[PDB]
Symmetry: C3
Subunit: 430 residues, 3 copies
Amino acid sequence: ATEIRASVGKMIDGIGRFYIQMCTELKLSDYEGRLIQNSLTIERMVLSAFKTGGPIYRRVDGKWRRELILYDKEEIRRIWRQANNGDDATAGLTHMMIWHSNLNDATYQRTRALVRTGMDPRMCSLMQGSTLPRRSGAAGAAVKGVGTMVMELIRMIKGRRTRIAYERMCNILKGKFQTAAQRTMVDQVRESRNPGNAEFEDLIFLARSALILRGSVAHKSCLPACVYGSAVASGYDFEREGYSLVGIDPFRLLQNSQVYSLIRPNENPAHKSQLVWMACHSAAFEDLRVSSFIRGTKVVPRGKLSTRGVQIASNENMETMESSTLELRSRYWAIRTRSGGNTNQQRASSGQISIQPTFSVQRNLPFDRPTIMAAFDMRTEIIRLMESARPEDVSFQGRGVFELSDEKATSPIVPSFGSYFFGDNAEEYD
Amino acid sequence: ATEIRASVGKMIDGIGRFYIQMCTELKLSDYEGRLIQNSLTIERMVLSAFKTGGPIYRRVDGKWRRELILYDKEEIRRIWRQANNGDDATAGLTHMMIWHSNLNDATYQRTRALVRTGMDPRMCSLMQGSTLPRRSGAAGAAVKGVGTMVMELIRMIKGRRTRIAYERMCNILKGKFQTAAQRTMVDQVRESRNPGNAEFEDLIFLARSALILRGSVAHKSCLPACVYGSAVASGYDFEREGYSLVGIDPFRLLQNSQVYSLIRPNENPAHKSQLVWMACHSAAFEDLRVSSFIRGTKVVPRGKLSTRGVQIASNENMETMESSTLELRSRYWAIRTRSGGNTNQQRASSGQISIQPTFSVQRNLPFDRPTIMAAFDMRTEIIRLMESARPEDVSFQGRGVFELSDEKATSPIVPSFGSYFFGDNAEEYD
Amino acid sequence: ATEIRASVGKMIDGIGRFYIQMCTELKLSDYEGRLIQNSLTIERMVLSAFKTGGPIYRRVDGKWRRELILYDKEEIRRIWRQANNGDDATAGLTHMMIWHSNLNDATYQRTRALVRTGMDPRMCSLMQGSTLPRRSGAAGAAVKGVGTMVMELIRMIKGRRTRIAYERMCNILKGKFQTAAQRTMVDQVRESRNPGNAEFEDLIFLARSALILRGSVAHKSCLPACVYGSAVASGYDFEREGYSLVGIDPFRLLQNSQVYSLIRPNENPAHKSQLVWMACHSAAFEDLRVSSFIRGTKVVPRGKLSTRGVQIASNENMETMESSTLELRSRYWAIRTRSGGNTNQQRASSGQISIQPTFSVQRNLPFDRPTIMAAFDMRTEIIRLMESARPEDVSFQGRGVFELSDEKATSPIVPSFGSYFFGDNAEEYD
Ligand SMILES: COc1ccccc1-c1noc(C)c1C(=O)N1CCN(c2cc(NC(=O)c3cccs3)c([N+](=O)[O-])cc2Cl)CC1
Ligand SMILES: COc1ccccc1-c1noc(C)c1C(=O)N1CCN(c2cc(NC(=O)c3cccs3)c([N+](=O)[O-])cc2Cl)CC1
Ligand SMILES: COc1ccccc1-c1noc(C)c1C(=O)N1CCN(c2cc(NC(=O)c3cccs3)c([N+](=O)[O-])cc2Cl)CC1
């Protein structure tokens, strides 16, 4: 924990130094350095470098001006190595990849990718880290949803180091499943000599099962590089303080940070704020109800957002662009979880699914139809298992949100009770 | 379009002239002529004539008085032929039948008819035009719901011109189904030599399928004859202007019209207004949500209506009757559709049916159970097809309501979001 | 009716006299006598006596003091016999047992008992009178839920008077089922020579079926002894007036009564009030919606109650205890029913389960999926029967609540429309 916080704090400290360095190299003002569009281009450069460049936006003469700078990849690689105390440091690089993955997950529906791989486009909640490269870092493997893994494996199915790459990914997915039955099916997909349709079929089944018997996907709050750089510069020492991705740290960092974004004429700056907030806390596929309660303001579905992507294309013109503050703070904080919720146990039930009339009064007599009717080889075990589950079943018992003043997470608030971010479009009202 | 508007405008112009003529024949005042109960009796007469009569209500000495007039059928037939520029004109006659059908559909549940034919009384949404005679006009065929057709065909199943009548009706129903599978079943019902139980069974199946894979039923705004007559008299030329049943025209006509109704002591005049508004725009089986949004005031379920039928029986006494204005205007207008919504395509999905927990917080983890579990000869194709459909699936993409000032339907309003008119009674709370 | 009211009034009159007698024997003040915790201990004594005692709470020196008195069982038995005009009187004894049963049903979830017997812990609505002894009184048999009966029978399955005890209980349960099919299964469980697993399996099936095809369980408003005693003393004659358990009487009795309860520091006195109100009208497993409408204030789920049990354990200290008035009155009253609602008939349907689009507008097209899809040896009859039922189906047609001024129940109020009391806990959100 102390040791984990040590190295995590070491990599964020490295990202910070690099960004500051890069900001002076481009002679950007502090405000300009803290424009989300500038941070992404700088993030893109160091990721691409492992000549290159992209749009860098300057406040010039009361107007926003675009410029596509170019840097030698050898020079960037040097600047990254040296901001990270000599070492090559692939850790912070993958941390900035996961940040981009989270923003992608929050911005774009990847249905076109899903249908090509033979997957149902309603599996987006399984798709964390799908834009993240195949065989990324260990942290990248940790963060990838069940569907991402399944998608990657079918791309394979569609040179004996190909076999080990296949096996590694089978094992990654297996480690994500919380039931032995699902785990046993992955062994059957892995054990296959010369994989094909039966494996494809199996993986589609597993993906669908992961909608109810959800897998263990890690969630890591990853912030634009400018946030870390701004913190280092302002006097914060991530090596002395340590740092965490799943605890209070990132919430408390955003609470002391101010990030900006370029805003188009049609766009609501609050809606841009929601998007980058979601991305920051890897919350694209969270229940909107909890996202709201945590933030303090309503987290609206994608379809009701009066905004488009964070990045401003080379096509559109700068003379209409204004720049707004991003609202990334929260009312409460909550630990980020690796868990997919309850899947196992089935230790009794404890509840009520029908009523017994006491009074002679006209009314309907409510009962939980799917639950009552429900009770009337590894494939059928899974079927029976998800047939047993109910949307009403509670996970994370005893756990709750925390006040920002609660450093040590001592007094959990359990919240009382629109769930899907991608539920509202021209085809479906979910 | 111009040609369609020409003839439609010609038949409404004919109905108009006839009503004016009839109003002078009975020496009725303009107000009296625009009493819905008077219009229906005049409508009844010309329909029955193809001696006869019915109750005609006059404002006499500060009180409402009833009188059952009588006209020779030869004289009425002459008056109809001559108001329609010589010609026999069966078009306007069937237009006044469809108006009566729409009012019937809005007023009376026809469960007793449904059970005799072996049909489920919950199929009322399939029952448009069930009170309309068998083998009416082409417009009558167009307006009949899937269930009406099925009901008519079973009545048959329960003299070789009987065979062609059977075949015509099979083809009418077939032309209504939007899926080839349903269409293929109708061919199997039609092809049958000496039809019986298997056909009955097939038709019950098709009817049930039309609740999810809905058929193409035409909808035509048809107004009481007084509305058209009042318009002709006031200076409107339906031949010069043309006229439409599915566009803006009828909405804009009601906007410039004022209709009255006799009201009983218990009845709410607003609730009478809702009923005749629904009837007018053939909306008895529309979603209450859209009916409301269009009208601007809430369209309440049948069970919550403090009113009975428009027609006042010969039994009840006139001394308690008062007369109220009918409120038939709307906030918005919308094109009337022939479509039954989406049934085909299945081009991907694009949505979200489960959540992936990001935060360690106590809550249930919502998922779309029926949809996820769903994925686990022409009869089974249909079963699989309606098993694939979901209540959340969106039809009429891109289409919306219009401001009354928007003649050419240029700026569609897409509405944001109690659905069943016949959902609330002593047996069921739908 | 007059004869039934005669004897019922006779037993409540007996309970009343006994309580008054007991109150003087303990030299308690009227206020002290009307403390719910005192009444229960006195109720416990006469039930246990058929030496003994329990905690009796006195208001001493501005503080609440506890004392565990002791009485000879021979003396209590004498006091009960003599307050009941000589006779042994087992009737009032079982009436005080049913009162305790109702409070138990309202206070404690009995999942631990359910799981041992192999039953689903979600069957609590079937569990009326489970804490009531096996083979209680006839009134006790009447009041026991389907699940209680099933639980009792499995305890058996897990000395030929054992056979008759088995058969009596099979017949009790049978008399509760409203469908012949369920009744026929009980005959098959009863007819079994040397019962075992097949019977266990059968009874679990029947219990589950009783969640939809609900059985006839009697409900009797039974009040703490202090309420009856207080009434006798104040001048009310239950033999001259008669008395009822299912009519207006108990509501009207509570309306003229004032009961108290000891309250802990954390507890909301209103929430204590809800609990004892529910217990009093045997309403633990009623729909919360009707319980509310009747009472006039919201009847909250168990999980949202800031209270624990009525009885104060010997462990906890008296110096923190305060005493509050219990709010047991109601806005309306309603007859208590023996019925389990509709299970039979299936006389047509009359309703609407889908919509037919009239307007070309973007929206989803709602349909009742489970109902439409539903239509696609005694075990299968039951399956088909509960598959036919719907949560939306209305029972007790024409019946409603009454104003407290409406003695003869002349003007029924039919109510317009959270249902489960035990639906909210750390495992489930129902
Ligand atoms: C205690 O104050 C300081 C503390 C340190 C440095 C400067 C100050 C300081 N010097 O002047 C003022 C004024 C200051 C000040 O009050 N703050 C507010 C908090 N700030 C902040 C806090 C955190 N994390 C956590 O606090 C925790 C994480 C886990 C349990 S607590 C992170 N992060 O981990 O990323 C970033 C930032 Cl920027 C630092 C600046
Ligand atoms: C433009 O005005 C006139 C226009 C014509 C005649 C008189 C006037 C007129 N002369 O004086 C005043 C004052 C007038 C006036 O303003 N109105 C309001 C609209 N009225 C009306 C409009 C329609 N249809 C449509 O407008 C459309 C349908 C499709 C696109 S537009 C229908 N219908 O088709 O059944 C019935 C009626 Cl009654 C006619 C009278
Ligand atoms: C009519 O008044 C009296 C009537 C009798 C005795 C005294 C009074 C009386 N003497 O002075 C005042 C003042 C009085 C008074 O107004 N009440 C209110 C009602 N009280 C009461 C009413 C009932 N039942 C029913 O009323 C019905 C049950 C069914 C249809 S009506 C029950 N119960 O059956 O358990 C308990 C009680 Cl305590 C009795 C006292």
